[PDB]
């Protein structure tokens, strides 16, 4: 009866028979790719095509995670870092161009969305930081891509258990919350922090009805997609299982559970969704990219004009 979906990953650069089978379950709604799955844009495009032949409705995401190493031969477009963009007189335009460039290439290789490091708002003048991230978001949207931020509500220092942050809500409100409050009406999706704020709630933000429903949906009026944090944590030696955690995440109001780097865990989370007979959240297809896969994107005028602006500003070449 209830609503939810799973986002998972694969181990390699091409699909296994096991991947093909698990992709057919309708409770699987997403796939994310990482460096280990990427050889070059051409192989990424062909991989996305193979997945869409199984499931045209999958949301396909690439995690950029602060640069993916060595896209040297026919690689992905190299974009300036946001700190370099900020120190220009036309930083807002340049951030727009960067978001449009990244989103245009990502969808040209058949993906729906990118998890971009500039939209990690708590691991980055903060009002100017919000302004430049908003401009990056306009570029992404102009290319037809939905924009994901993290980590709500914010915690960018250190902790091997799960971090706890002892600040009041009014102290969080006047600090880490401010980027989110400002981009909430512009972001299409958010990922929560793997942090407990005991002054506010005893559960991590990603399993807290109070963080997700009362502060985020209520106070911040956010109506986009809530991704869970990583419900597998493969290698961290946690106890509990991806199956109990995805139940906990959907209970709190997550739309889609992420189970990365642990196929065993993804299968347990999937069995959990099957028993629930979940159907996809009505929100979910907001993340579908309006762009399309193609190979001529680098010869288009808007692409060459975006690069010319970056170059005039001294940022590339």
**Which parts of this chain interact with Zn ion (CB under 5 A)?**
120, 122-123, 151
Q: At its nearest, how many Å lie between Zn ion and the CB of residue 313? A: 27
Residue 58's φ and ψ, nearest 5 degrees, are: -65, 145
Q: At its nearest, how many Å lie between Zn ion and the CB of residue 24? A: 33
Q: Which residue has the tokens 């958010």?
A: 190
| Choice between 113 and 243, CB closer to Zn ion | 113
| Choice between 109 and 121, CB closer to Zn ion | 121
- Between β-strands 196-197 and 28-33, what pairing exists: parallel, antiparallel or unpaired? unpaired
Q: At its nearest, how many Å lie between Zn ion and the CB of residue 115? A: 11
| Choice between 29 and 149, CB closer to Zn ion | 149
Pick from 227, 124, 225, 102: nearest CA to 178: 124
Annotated ligand binding at 20? The verdict is: no
Annotated ligand binding at 71? The verdict is: yes
Which residue among the candidates 122, 176, 229, 230 is catalytic per the annotation?
A: 229
Annotated ligand binding at 277? The verdict is: no
**Token pair recorded at residue 227:** 């991704």
Active site residue 229: yes
Q: At its nearest, how many Å lie between Zn ion and the CB of residue 154? A: 7
| Choice between 88 and 148, CB closer to Zn ion | 148
Annotated ligand binding at 63? The verdict is: yes
Residues belonging to the active site = 229
Binding residues for substrate: 63, 71, 150-151
């Amino acid at each position: 009866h209830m609503q939810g979906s799973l986002m998972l990953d694969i181990g390699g650069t091409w699909l296994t028979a096991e991947d093909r089978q698990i992709l057919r379950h309708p409770e699987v709604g997403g796939l994310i790719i990482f460096a280990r799955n990427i050889e070059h844009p051409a192989q990424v495009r062909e991989l996305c095509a193979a997945i869409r032949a199984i499931r045209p409705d999958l949301l396909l995401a690439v995690d950029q995670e602060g640069g993916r190493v060595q896209r040297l031969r026919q690689g992905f477009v190299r974009l300036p870092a946001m700190r370099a963009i900020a120190d220009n007189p036309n930083a807002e335009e340049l951030a727009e161009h960067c978001g449009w460039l990244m989103a245009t290439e990502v969808q040209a290789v058949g993906l729906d969305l990118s998890f971009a490091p500039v939209l990690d708002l708590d691991h980055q003048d903060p009002e100017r930081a919000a302004l430049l991230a908003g401009a990056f978001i306009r570029g992404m949207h102009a290319a037809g891509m939905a924009a994901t931020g993290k980590h709500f509500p914010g915690h960018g220092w250190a902790e091997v258990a799960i971090p706890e942050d002892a600040r009041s809500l009014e102290e969080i409100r006047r600090s880490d919350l401010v980027p989110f409050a400002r981009l909430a009406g512009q972001l299409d999706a958010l990922m929560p922090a793997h942090v407990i704020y005991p002054q506010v709630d005893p559960q991590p933000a990603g399993f807290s009805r109070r963080w997700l429903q009362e502060i985020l949906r209520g106070e911040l009026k956010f109506d986009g997609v809530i991704f869970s944090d990583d419900l597998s944590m493969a290698g961290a030696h946690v106890v509990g299982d991806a199956a109990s955690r995805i139940e906990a995440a959907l209970a709190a109001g997550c739309d889609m559970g992420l189970v990365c780097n642990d196929r065993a865990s993804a299968e347990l989370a999937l069995a959990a969704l099957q028993r629930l007979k979940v159907t996809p959240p009505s929100r979910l297809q907001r993340m579908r990219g309006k762009g399309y896969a193609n190979t001529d994107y680098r010869q288009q005028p808007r692409w060459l004009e975006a690069l010319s602006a970056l170059r005039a500003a001294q940022l590339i070449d």
